Amino acid sequence: MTRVLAVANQKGAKTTTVASIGAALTEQGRRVLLVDLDPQGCLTFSLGHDPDKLPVSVHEVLLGDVEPSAALVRTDEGMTLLPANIDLAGAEAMLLMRAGREYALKRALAKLDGDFDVVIIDCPPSLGVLTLNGLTAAHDVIVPLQCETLAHRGVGQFLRTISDVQQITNPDLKLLGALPTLYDSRTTHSRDVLLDVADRYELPVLAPPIPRTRKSKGAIAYREFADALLRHWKSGRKMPTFTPE
């Protein structure tokens, strides 16, 4: 039964998280679809495709000009990727024009139901139509959250956006919480940042933190986190928190 995970943060980490979780699930046996929703094509390029060379992309898919299957490409790691390129910047403009703009990705993913166990979506650093499509198509959402500095301005706005989405396009959407990234355990300041965020906002901060970056510390953390996701989806186990219950 397909699970869809949105990965979102309007502040510009994020893409590494999509890719690394994707590969960890692919290791643990699951069929994984990654979706690039950023016209800059970060995920797509990081997975080895040149977005400027792609004959078609998620752009044509959102618009209905190409069927989803025809736009998918392979990755070395085993995941399947629905890629993006700068064309996608045009969809954002053409989509507000139409009705039910929010559901374009959702409809495209429905065609692929049964082909994949998990879908992970890389939302652009914005809270526009593209990110709305990602959140409207997801069961679950996490925000990858940097803790190098104290600049968690924006978390309030992000929560207000999640809440708005639950009200009108996707009532089933669940905020699993914040995945800390760029965690530095050499001083306490990273921890300080997370304790502060958890205290200001109605936002679970999840474990383990991804440290500043095959058997790496970051790899282990991503693997450990992918496993928590799997168990959460299978048996409803709560996601373990940075500060344990």
169 annotated ligand binder: no
Contacts of 198 (CB under 8 A, 6+ apart): 204, 205, 242, 243
The residues facing 85 across adjacent strands are: none
| Residue 219 burial (C-beta neighbours within 10 Å; 0-12, 13-18, 19+) | middle
CA distance 116 to 136: 19
Q: What are phi and psi of 141, to 5 degrees?
A: -140, 140
Nearest to 138 by CA among 115, 157, 159, 162: 162
CA distance 35 to 131: 12
Nearest to 100 by CA among 61, 140, 63: 63
SS3 223: helix
53 annotated ligand binder: no
234 annotated ligand binder: no
The residues facing 142 across adjacent strands are: 7, 177
| Residue 103 burial (C-beta neighbours within 10 Å; 0-12, 13-18, 19+) | middle
16 annotated ligand binder: yes
131 annotated ligand binder: no
204 annotated ligand binder: no
Instruction: Provide the annotated binding site for Mg(2+).
Output: 15
Binding residues for ADP: 13-16, 211, 213
Q: Residues annotated as binding site? A: 13-16, 211, 213
